[PDB]
Amino acid sequence: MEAKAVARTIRIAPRKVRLVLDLIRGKNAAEAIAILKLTNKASSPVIEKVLMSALANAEHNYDMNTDELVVKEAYANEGPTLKRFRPRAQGRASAINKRTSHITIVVSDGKE
Amino acid sequence: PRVKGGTVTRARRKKTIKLAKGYFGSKHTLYKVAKQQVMKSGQYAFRDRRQRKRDFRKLWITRINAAARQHEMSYSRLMNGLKKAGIDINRKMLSEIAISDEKAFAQLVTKAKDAL
Amino acid sequence: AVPKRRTSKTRKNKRRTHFKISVPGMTECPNCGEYKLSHRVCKNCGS
Amino acid sequence: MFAIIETGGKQIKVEEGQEIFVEKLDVNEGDTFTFDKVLFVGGDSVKVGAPTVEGATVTATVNKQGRGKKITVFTYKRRKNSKRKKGHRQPYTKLTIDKINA
Amino acid sequence: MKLHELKPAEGSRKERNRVGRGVATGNGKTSGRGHKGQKARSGGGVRPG
Amino acid sequence: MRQTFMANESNIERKWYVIDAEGQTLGRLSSEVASILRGKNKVTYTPHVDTGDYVIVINASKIEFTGNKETDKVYYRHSNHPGGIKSITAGELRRTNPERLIENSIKGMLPSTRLGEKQGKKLFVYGGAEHPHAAQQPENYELRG
RNA sequence: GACAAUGGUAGGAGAGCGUUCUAAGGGCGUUGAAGCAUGAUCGUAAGGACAUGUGGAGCGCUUAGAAGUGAGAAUGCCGGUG
RNA sequence: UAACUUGGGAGUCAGAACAUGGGUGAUAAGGUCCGUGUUCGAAAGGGAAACAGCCCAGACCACCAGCUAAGGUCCCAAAAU
RNA sequence: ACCGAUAGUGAACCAGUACCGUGAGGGAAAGGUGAAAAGCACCCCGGAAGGGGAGUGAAAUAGAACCUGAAACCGUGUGCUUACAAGUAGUCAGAGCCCGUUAAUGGGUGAUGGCGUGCCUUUUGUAGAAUGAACCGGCGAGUUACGAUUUGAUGCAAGGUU
């Protein structure tokens, strides 16, 4: 079957969370978890919590085997952006963008 | 009575955006650049619909020349002879015959060689 | 000192070809079940 | 065996059992048309006519009488505010070679 | 005479001319006013006579 | 689009030829070879595909010129460097490396396109009279002056 | 039917397409209207239809009438995203 | 096969090469000022390698038909080694 | 035959209010769940936020809640194609692969060949190294009231009209 878990409004730029999503795409649940505990990034800890939740849903709501699962899909969409200001040289003011992210993970066993 | 110009500009712009399908870059997205490309496309087709009648005629002549050079003769000499013989075959037909039934072409040359 | 023309999506995606992370060592443990870094302090301490 | 007929304003190399497209003719779908302008007759015997082979005809049957794909003609001036858009549909006629009475 | 099928006298009404509405109508950007000068300015023109 | 035969793959037949440059004008010989390479003497000639054959010059070191062309007719070449212009007379280019003298000459009468470069790779020039292509069984080809 | 004729800027003149509202007549709609998306469809052009998906209450046709009636450029104004 | 009269709307008042007849300049200028023509302006198409003003010629639309003009026919590249 | 949330008052909502200036003064942005809160009891992952089930409902429509397009922009997966090549990126010709429509001399990609210096404004002349536009989504320029003159239409006519 197929199980998924999403994390909305995640305070983290989508370009930085898309660098750790290209390391667990098409890997096994076991390997993926091990790779997320060795990666030195600020998104690994957040992504690891989402992957864990996705596995629990496939072992409870679908009661599937968690010893033969494989990460099928894994992407991150953009979310509401906050607008901020900070002073410059003279009386000018530059703009700051605090973008968010919508992490999503779909775990499956590879069987219709 | 006020008249809103909605659902009339998008419908006209969408038609031009669908006419530029298969372009490279943002030429199949942005309407501004798309329009310019479409306009140029139409100007090329019109001018390329008259150059296609000259390109194909240049091809036939080439083929005939090669096929007419296998019987110790030149295109200019063959063409001249055929006209004096009274034949009215087209250049596209003359080439087609030579490519396929080569035996038939041989006879034609003989007739043109008899008219000197 | 300022861009003469804006960069396209093609050229921008071509410059980000070597911009990525690399998978680490991740040495297997003899008695713990979980993985660990090579030449580290744990239950594996490398292999 | 093949023959070279001259219909409309050009020449076509047809053969027994073959579909061809010519200019709008004056007939009705399901009728029989016969060409009397034969310039060449290939196959076993070779008959090369002078202006045209005397005593040569080709019969065929009309199949359809529709129009071609719509062509959009569009031209314009560089800076001069002037342009023109136009459509076109060249009418045609589909026939099927029957016999080649040499 | 039926209110759902009225008909005005043949050739007794015409549509007004609108300038500055495309280049296919004939009166484009210049709207038949030439190029520059004092007769091309808004509210321009010398006093009659 | 009525009916016009168009050559393509699995329909083109390329053969091998052996031309002799024994007492032949450089330009006069090159011109003839060029046409053969492009395949303009074939009845099924097509411009968007290669239908030419392979040519093989045997002699090439016995090529002759006309007038004082061996003393003049210098061959210049730049190396994309300030003041990097080198030259060499045709007569001095015939004594050493005479195969390049014919190659360039025949390569200058071909179109400068992708097909033009691929059509120029079907030419083999030598200096002696023995070619290592006996497995292709190439036949002699008389120059139609 | 002949017979000629048909390049175009400033500018003359003629014939039309579409948009919002009103009148009269005849119609459509929870068995799914307008809008939105997709399509290999029709007209000489501006344009017009059908079918399918989303949508959940209004909307077009015929002949007239009245206009805040058509957008690619003004270092145009405002928002959004590069 | 045009012309004239009367009336309704106009735009134009910075022109440019080329070939002739002249002034000015130095029988200098892609100079400048007149007169007689043609083309560009507002004209695509072929030739002059590329080249608004040179030469040939004015595009209602379609066709994988034919005859010519200037200029051309060894290869690039249509046609005489 | 007025407007329908960039419209109509500056103000449909927290308007002369946030804010800005020593002061006189200047002056915004912002409407919409459903017929009825019946506003997600309960279980699972998690510190929480957020999610997956299960439930109420005609339909999650779930409290950044009618519809939700783009010029946009940012992604994930796939059918064809690409690492010897000089490019206003298109147009005509055209193999090879892959599909199957409003069914018609079909559709998608495209190895190779020929031809080809964007658009507007201003100029005798602009590919111009002259001007303007980052991406147009919305708004944004011959109008009305009185007179005058000429043309078309209708009514009556030595009378015509208030």
Side-chain angles (χ1 to χ4, degrees), chain D residues 28-43:
Chain D
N28 308 319
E29 339 203 38
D31 287 337
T32 309
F33 200 85
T34 91
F35 306 93
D36 1 50
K37 248 146 223 32
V38 183
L39 316 195
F40 194 83
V41 169

Side-chain angles (χ1 to χ4, degrees), chain F residues 6-15 34-42 44-55 110-111 113-123:
Chain F
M6 292 282 255
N8 55 8
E9 243 354 307
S10 83
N11 211 26
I12 286 167
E13 186 38 53
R14 316 204 182 78
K15 317 193 132 3
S35 70
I36 285 175
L37 279 183
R38 263 159 79 55
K40 298 269 301 319
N41 52 343
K42 251 128 163 262
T44 81
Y45 159 80
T46 305
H48 67 89
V49 284
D50 176 5
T51 62
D53 318 324
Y54 305 77
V55 196
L110 282 181
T113 85
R114 299 197 189 192
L115 196 65
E117 306 285 345
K118 176 161 337 314
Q119 252 158 4
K121 274 164 225 181
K122 286 151 29 151
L123 168 74

Side-chain angles (χ1 to χ4, degrees), chain F residues 51-66:
Chain F
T51 62
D53 318 324
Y54 305 77
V55 196
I56 286 164
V57 192
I58 37 175
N59 277 300
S61 92
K62 268 126 162 229
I63 205 94
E64 53 210 13
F65 308 101
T66 36

Side-chain angles (χ1 to χ4, degrees), chain C residues 6 9 12-13 16:
Chain C
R6 99 211 194 129
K9 318 209 242 185
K12 159 183 88 154
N13 283 328
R16 310 189 169 147

Side-chain angles (χ1 to χ4, degrees), chain D residues 20-43 45-53 55-76:
Chain D
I20 49 133
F21 300 70
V22 303
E23 300 282 13
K24 221 243 356 246
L25 279 189
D26 187 309
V27 262
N28 308 319
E29 339 203 38
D31 287 337
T32 309
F33 200 85
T34 91
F35 306 93
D36 1 50
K37 248 146 223 32
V38 183
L39 316 195
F40 194 83
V41 169
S45 30
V46 152
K47 278 132 127 328
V48 152
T52 243
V53 161
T57 48
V58 170
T59 58
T61 86
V62 180
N63 273 344
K64 204 190 337 174
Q65 278 243 120
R67 312 152 94 201
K69 274 281 297 331
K70 195 217 216 11
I71 281 163
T72 301
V73 190
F74 179 114
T75 76
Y76 76 119

